Design a protein around this ligand. Sequence first.
Ligand SMILES: C[C@]12CCC(=O)C[C@@H]1CC[C@@H]1[C@@H]2CC[C@]2(C)[C@@H](O)CC[C@@H]12
Lengths: 14, 250
Amino acid sequence: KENALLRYLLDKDD
Amino acid sequence: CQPIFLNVLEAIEPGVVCAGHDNNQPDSFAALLSSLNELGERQLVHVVKWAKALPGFRNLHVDDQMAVIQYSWMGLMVFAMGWRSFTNVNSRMLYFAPDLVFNEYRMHKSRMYSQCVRMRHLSQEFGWLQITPQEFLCMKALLLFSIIPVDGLKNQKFFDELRMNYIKELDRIIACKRKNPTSCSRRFYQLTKLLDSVQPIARELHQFTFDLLIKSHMVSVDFPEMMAEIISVQVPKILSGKVKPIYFHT
Ligand SMILES: C[C@]12CCC(=O)C[C@@H]1CC[C@@H]1[C@@H]2CC[C@]2(C)[C@@H](O)CC[C@@H]12
């Protein structure tokens, strides 16, 4: 999505 | 008959987050605000991990997941901060972070004294209404589903069902341990009023951060990567009326 960083935080497993 | 829903909210509740402010240096508008912006970026990372672990959240469309986070972070963070202030300093001061506690002097130096006064007031409500830890947790979760665009989300239906279930749970926390129906209705009324009072505060903070972003290069204030993008793209939609909060009352 637009906010690349935020989008990464959502699909990244933690 | 264990509180499955409550167990979850308690288990996923974020821990302590520091801002990295140097209280050893004299308070200045630039230093205070730069520290708040950094704190925002840090708590934002925590809000994402918390949200993903909320029941039903991953059911929403990916685009909607990012939308609710981008639009409701302010309100969520202000509510949590209000609770921290209450439990830690009994609403005497604004407990943004362990290394960033605002007294009357800092409230003035930040150039947002009026907004701080309303936040302190909200914090006092937690005491005046005797808000319990369980009620706090459920209200904060509901706050993630309290602001959306007028044109609706990609999958509005899933969102409506999700928000409906969370309101139901809040009703459960109030209904249980309370026989008198008049007291239940009275309690729900008070809590919904409390949730609604968060929105006016968030809007004022949105306007303030947006204006600061525009002139950040003049006041020597830094905005983190994600913050600068959300405020320049998402916040404006809130200020132009495209995205609006959902109030229980009118
Ligand atoms: C969300 C934060 C930071 C996290 C918190 O505890 C609540 C607080 C409310 C005021 C916000 C601040 C982040 C940075 C902002 C957005 C400043 O730019 C002006 C208003 C500040």
